[PDB]
Amino acid sequence: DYVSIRVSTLRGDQKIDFNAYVKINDKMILYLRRGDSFEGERLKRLKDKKLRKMYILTDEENSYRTYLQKNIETAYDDTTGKDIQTRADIIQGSQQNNAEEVFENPENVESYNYCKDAAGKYVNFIMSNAQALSAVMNIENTDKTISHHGVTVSTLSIALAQKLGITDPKKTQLLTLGALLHDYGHHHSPLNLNQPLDSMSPEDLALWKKHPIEGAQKVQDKKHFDQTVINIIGQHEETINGTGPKGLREKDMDPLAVLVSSANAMDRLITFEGVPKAEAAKKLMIDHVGKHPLQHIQHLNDILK
């Protein structure tokens, strides 16, 4: 009777041609009403509620799904000169959505290639628009979800990739996709990420240390998965002085996973540890001395401001 949708797919200024319900005590409350839109402070109010899921009437699906396609279509369109926060709203939420599919459907070959394909679209979107990054960085991770945090890391990762003069589209594409999915090993996990790793109980820290090794075990076996991606998923907590979980050093890694390992260190601070954007790079230079290419750290410092 009802079909669930992910909230990150409701973005931008197009008025909806369907109603959307949230579930309370097994009943479906009508929350979002026909003609509603989500541009501006609307998206914040919408995210202040920890709604991961909403629902639509099985006979309003086409309406919704048509809405979603037109949404992403026109958002990638570089021509329409539509507001950049607006386009960024739509695409960030869409990248976030694609990563959730793969996370819940990692064996689904077709989901993967959609995400991978979208990854490419995102790169071309980030490079080809000056505003993009600062606009995508406006959308907070209020929920603190690994899917949104993975969109954030991929974003830092692209900008970083550009500073380092990494240009191969197959590579920025594969880099982004693997940053997006980078935390799949946290998926369905008891661990509360919203704390600092120093303030972690040994029961948490040891549960945290397992996540790259486990996350990678769960996908190295699926032929449709690129190896760069498996590597990124498996290696992104590794640090150049080998203090990360597997204890790898720069020689042992995917170069692209070093680059992701740095872009992740930044957002764990900003998002999971409440360090203000401006001081994250500094925190790392001092309290995380040795763990990351200082050049990476420097560039990310620039990117932020």
Of 93 and 234, which CB lies nearer to Fe ion in the complex structure? 234
Of 176 and 264, which CB lies nearer to Fe ion in the complex structure? 264
Binding region for Fe(3+): 149, 182-183, 211, 236-237, 264
Binding residues for Fe ion, total number by CB under 5 A = 2
Binding part of the chain for Fe ion, among 7-15, 88-96, 176-184, 255-263 by CB under 5 A, reads: 176-184
Binding region: 149, 182-183, 211, 236-237, 264
Q: Does 100 interact with Fe ion (rule: CB under 5 A)?
A: no
Of 71, 176, 264, 271, which one interacts with Fe ion (CB under 5 A)?
A: 264
Binding part of the chain for Fe ion, among 63-71, 195-203, 258-266, 293-301 by CB under 5 A, reads: 258-266
Binding part of the chain for Fe ion, among 17-25, 132-140, 177-185, 294-302 by CB under 5 A, reads: 177-185
CB of 211 to Fe ion, least distance (A): 6
201 to each of 192, 197, 206, 211, how far by Cα in Å? Answer: 11, 9, 8, 16
Q: Does 183 interact with Fe ion (rule: CB under 5 A)?
A: yes
Binding part of the chain for Fe ion, among 53-61, 70-78, 82-90, 181-189 by CB under 5 A, reads: 181-189
CB of 21 to Fe ion, least distance (A): 32
Q: Tell which phi-psi region holds residue 248, choosing left (phi > 0), alpha (psi between -120 and 50) or beta.
A: beta
State how far the Cα of 122 lies from the Cα of 110, in Å rounded to an integer: 18
Q: Does 238 interact with Fe ion (rule: CB under 5 A)?
A: no
Binding part of the chain for Fe ion, among 86-94, 114-122, 198-206, 257-265 by CB under 5 A, reads: 257-265
CB of 238 to Fe ion, least distance (A): 10
CB of 268 to Fe ion, least distance (A): 6
Of 42 and 218, which CB lies nearer to Fe ion in the complex structure? 218
Of 83 and 214, which CB lies nearer to Fe ion in the complex structure? 214
Of 37 and 220, which CB lies nearer to Fe ion in the complex structure? 220
By CB under 5 A, name the binding residues for Fe ion: 183, 264
